[PDB]
Design an enzyme around this catalytic site. Structure first.
Site, short mmCIF file in Angstrom:
data_model
loop_
_atom_site.label_atom_id
_atom_site.label_comp_id
_atom_site.label_asym_id
_atom_site.label_seq_id
_atom_site.Cartn_x
_atom_site.Cartn_y
_atom_site.Cartn_z
N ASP A 43 0.85 -1.18 0.00
CA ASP A 43 0.00 0.00 0.00
C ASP A 43 0.89 1.24 0.00
OD1 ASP A 43 -2.81 1.17 0.45
OD2 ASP A 43 -1.59 2.24 1.92
N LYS A 77 -2.52 5.96 -4.47
CA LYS A 77 -3.62 6.85 -4.16
C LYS A 77 -3.37 8.23 -4.77
CE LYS A 77 -3.80 4.52 0.31
NZ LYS A 77 -2.38 4.43 0.68
N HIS A 110 -7.63 9.28 -2.30
CA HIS A 110 -7.06 9.16 -0.96
C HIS A 110 -7.99 9.68 0.13
CE1 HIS A 110 -2.88 8.92 1.09
NE2 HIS A 110 -3.80 8.57 1.96
N1 LIG Z 1 -5.90 5.79 3.35
C1 LIG Z 1 -5.46 6.52 4.34
O1 LIG Z 1 -5.86 7.65 4.57
C2 LIG Z 1 -4.47 5.90 5.27
C3 LIG Z 1 -4.29 6.43 6.54
C4 LIG Z 1 -3.41 5.81 7.40
C5 LIG Z 1 -2.74 4.66 7.01
N2 LIG Z 1 -2.89 4.15 5.75
C6 LIG Z 1 -2.14 2.94 5.32
O2 LIG Z 1 -2.20 1.98 6.35
C7 LIG Z 1 -0.85 1.66 6.74
C8 LIG Z 1 -0.81 1.20 8.18
O3 LIG Z 1 -1.26 2.25 9.06
P1 LIG Z 1 -0.22 3.11 9.92
O4 LIG Z 1 1.06 3.26 9.20
O5 LIG Z 1 -0.97 4.34 10.30
O6 LIG Z 1 0.03 2.29 11.27
P2 LIG Z 1 -0.01 0.84 11.86
O7 LIG Z 1 0.29 -0.13 10.78
O8 LIG Z 1 -1.23 0.69 12.66
O9 LIG Z 1 1.21 0.95 12.89
C9 LIG Z 1 2.57 1.13 12.41
C10 LIG Z 1 3.45 1.31 13.60
O10 LIG Z 1 3.45 0.09 14.38
C11 LIG Z 1 4.79 -0.36 14.52
N3 LIG Z 1 4.83 -1.81 14.46
C12 LIG Z 1 4.60 -2.56 13.33
N4 LIG Z 1 4.59 -3.85 13.53
C13 LIG Z 1 4.87 -3.97 14.88
C14 LIG Z 1 5.00 -5.10 15.71
N5 LIG Z 1 4.92 -6.36 15.26
N6 LIG Z 1 5.34 -4.88 16.99
C15 LIG Z 1 5.41 -3.61 17.42
N7 LIG Z 1 5.30 -2.47 16.73
C16 LIG Z 1 4.98 -2.73 15.46
C17 LIG Z 1 5.58 0.30 13.42
O11 LIG Z 1 6.96 0.43 13.81
P3 LIG Z 1 8.22 0.28 12.83
O12 LIG Z 1 7.77 0.63 11.38
O13 LIG Z 1 9.33 1.23 13.38
O14 LIG Z 1 8.62 -1.17 12.98
C18 LIG Z 1 4.92 1.65 13.35
O15 LIG Z 1 5.34 2.53 14.40
C19 LIG Z 1 -0.07 2.92 6.42
O16 LIG Z 1 1.34 2.72 6.47
C20 LIG Z 1 -0.66 3.26 5.04
O17 LIG Z 1 -0.12 2.35 4.09
C21 LIG Z 1 -3.79 4.75 4.90
O1 LIG Z 2 -3.32 10.19 4.25
C1 LIG Z 2 -2.77 9.19 4.79
O2 LIG Z 2 -2.70 8.09 4.27
C2 LIG Z 2 -2.21 9.35 6.15
C3 LIG Z 2 -2.01 10.76 6.59
N1 LIG Z 2 -2.95 11.23 7.37
N2 LIG Z 2 -2.81 12.51 7.84
C4 LIG Z 2 -3.98 13.00 8.56
C5 LIG Z 2 -5.02 13.46 7.56
N3 LIG Z 2 -6.26 13.65 7.86
C6 LIG Z 2 -6.96 14.19 6.76
C7 LIG Z 2 -8.30 14.57 6.74
C8 LIG Z 2 -8.78 15.05 5.56
CL1 LIG Z 2 -10.47 15.39 5.49
C9 LIG Z 2 -8.06 15.14 4.39
C10 LIG Z 2 -6.72 14.80 4.41
C11 LIG Z 2 -6.19 14.29 5.59
S1 LIG Z 2 -4.59 13.72 5.87
C12 LIG Z 2 -1.73 13.34 7.59
O3 LIG Z 2 -1.72 14.49 8.08
C13 LIG Z 2 -0.70 12.83 6.71
N4 LIG Z 2 0.40 13.59 6.41
C14 LIG Z 2 1.28 13.06 5.59
C15 LIG Z 2 1.13 11.80 5.04
N5 LIG Z 2 0.11 11.02 5.37
C16 LIG Z 2 -0.84 11.53 6.22
#
Ligand SMILES: NC(=O)c1ccc[n+]([C@@H]2O[C@H](COP(=O)([O-])OP(=O)(O)OC[C@H]3O[C@@H](n4cnc5c(N)ncnc54)[C@H](OP(=O)(O)O)[C@@H]3O)[C@@H](O)[C@H]2O)c1
Ligand SMILES: O=C(O)Cc1nn(Cc2nc3cc(Cl)ccc3s2)c(=O)c2nccnc12
Length: 315
Positions: A43, A77, A110
């Site tokens: 991702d 995204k 996104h």
């Molecule tokens: N669509 C969106 O708006 C959106 C928003 C947020 C996230 N995402 C996607 O979802 C992914 C995952 O979410 P996230 O990055 O917010 O966080 P997450 O996967 O919930 O947590 C990541 C964190 O947990 C730690 N970690 C990972 N595996 C671990 C384990 N086995 N034991 C202990 N700590 C562990 C990582 O540390 P280390 O990396 O230092 O090991 C990092 O600090 C993102 O990277 C992104 O690809 C999308």
């Molecule tokens: O968008 C993501 O995947 C995670 C993310 N989340 N956020 C929080 C956000 N909340 C919102 C809410 C809105 Cl409505 C729009 C864009 C965003 S981005 C960040 O500030 C940010 N900054 C840099 C890179 N990734 C992020």
């Protein structure tokens, strides 16, 4: 099963590697290790500012004959500053150039909110409010459909859309492609029961992001809740002789969600994959669902008066 069927007939691997906050200097090694241990879904996003380094890892493994391209499921995204219909294709082509690919398996809007186009990812006024763009979800969606017609992406979807926003796309006059996926925050403190039921009922696959509760999110406070340190979830892990991370990753899988834990740490990348050899009981599932607090880690205060801000609605 280890893959879910999308509306284009493709099989999306239920476990993927997340890459938000994976520094460019570390992510290439993270991706290479992920592919070696068996991840087949990555991702990505333009806003993560590390697509080039993810691309390097993919290309190396393709050239090493570790995997072929058709066995990988690569998601990226469209960032908020590129919602204008005429900017979407360029944005996609830039992501493809950075990743060194000729197509994406899935390309998502996104966030539902368009931001003013320009160099800044988060254009702010002098008072700190995000500056919106004169864009709307339906027109952006039409530009996303064109990417499918042109062969740049195999499937399109959405992220951080509430049920009314999903409904708006589904009811678009002249809709060409239904969204394949809605990627939303999902974990025991934000279980999303209504929006998941909605999306699944409409044949949209849900991907759970931040499944470990994003402990590295930039705006965390040490006081804030911590899923990985929650003693109740530690107890559930201990009972199965697994780690808390493994429980948190298995949880969404048993709800028929895709899940995308992030790590750049090789040991954890490998740990996180070891989730196909156990099952959480009915009691465990009920218990984890009971921890819901509507606690959302991914939102910005600065975006809350945008017309398309998604989290005022109940779901
Ligand atoms: N669509 C969106 O708006 C959106 C928003 C947020 C996230 N995402 C996607 O979802 C992914 C995952 O979410 P996230 O990055 O917010 O966080 P997450 O996967 O919930 O947590 C990541 C964190 O947990 C730690 N970690 C990972 N595996 C671990 C384990 N086995 N034991 C202990 N700590 C562990 C990582 O540390 P280390 O990396 O230092 O090991 C990092 O600090 C993102 O990277 C992104 O690809 C999308
Ligand atoms: O968008 C993501 O995947 C995670 C993310 N989340 N956020 C929080 C956000 N909340 C919102 C809410 C809105 Cl409505 C729009 C864009 C965003 S981005 C960040 O500030 C940010 N900054 C840099 C890179 N990734 C992020």
């Amino acid at each position: 099963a280890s893959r879910l069927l999308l509306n284009n007939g493709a099989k999306m691997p239920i476990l993927g590697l997340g890459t938000w906050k994976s520094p460019p200097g570390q992510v290439t090694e993270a991706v290479k290790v992920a592919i070696d241990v068996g991840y087949r879904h990555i991702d990505c996003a333009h806003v993560y500012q590390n697509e080039n380094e993810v691309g390097v890892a993919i290309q190396e493994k393709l050239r090493e004959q570790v995997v072929k391209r058709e066995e990988l499921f690569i998601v990226s995204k469209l960032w908020c500053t590129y919602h204008e219909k005429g900017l979407v294709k360029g944005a996609c082509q830039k992501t493809l150039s950075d990743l060194k690919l000729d197509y994406l398996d899935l390309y998502l809007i996104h966030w539902p909110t368009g931001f003013k186009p320009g160099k800044e990812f988060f254009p702010l006024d002098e008072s700190g409010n995000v500056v919106p763009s004169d864009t709307n979800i339906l027109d952006t969606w039409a530009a996303m459909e064109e990417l499918v017609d042109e062969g740049l992406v195999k499937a399109i979807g959405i992220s951080n859309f509430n049920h009314l926003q999903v409904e708006m796309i589904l009811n678009k006059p002249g809709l060409k492609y239904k969204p394949a996926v809605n990627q939303i925050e999902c974990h025991p403190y934000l279980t999303q029961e209504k929006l998941i039921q909605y999306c699944q009922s409409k044949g949209i696959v849900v991907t759970a992001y931040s499944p470990l509760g994003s402990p590295d999110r930039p705006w965390a406070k040490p006081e804030d809740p911590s899923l990985l340190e929650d003693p109740r979830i530690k107890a559930i892990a201990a009972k199965h002789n697994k780690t808390t991370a493994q429980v948190l990753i298995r949880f969404p899988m048993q709800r028929n969600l895709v899940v995308i834990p992030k790590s750049v740490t090789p040991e954890r990348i490998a740990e996180n994959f070891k989730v196909f050899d156990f099952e959480l009981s009915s009691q465990d599932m009920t218990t984890l669902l009971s921890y819901n607090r509507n606690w959302r880690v991914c939102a910005l205060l600065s975006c809350t008066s945008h017309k398309d801000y998604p989290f005022h609605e109940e779901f």
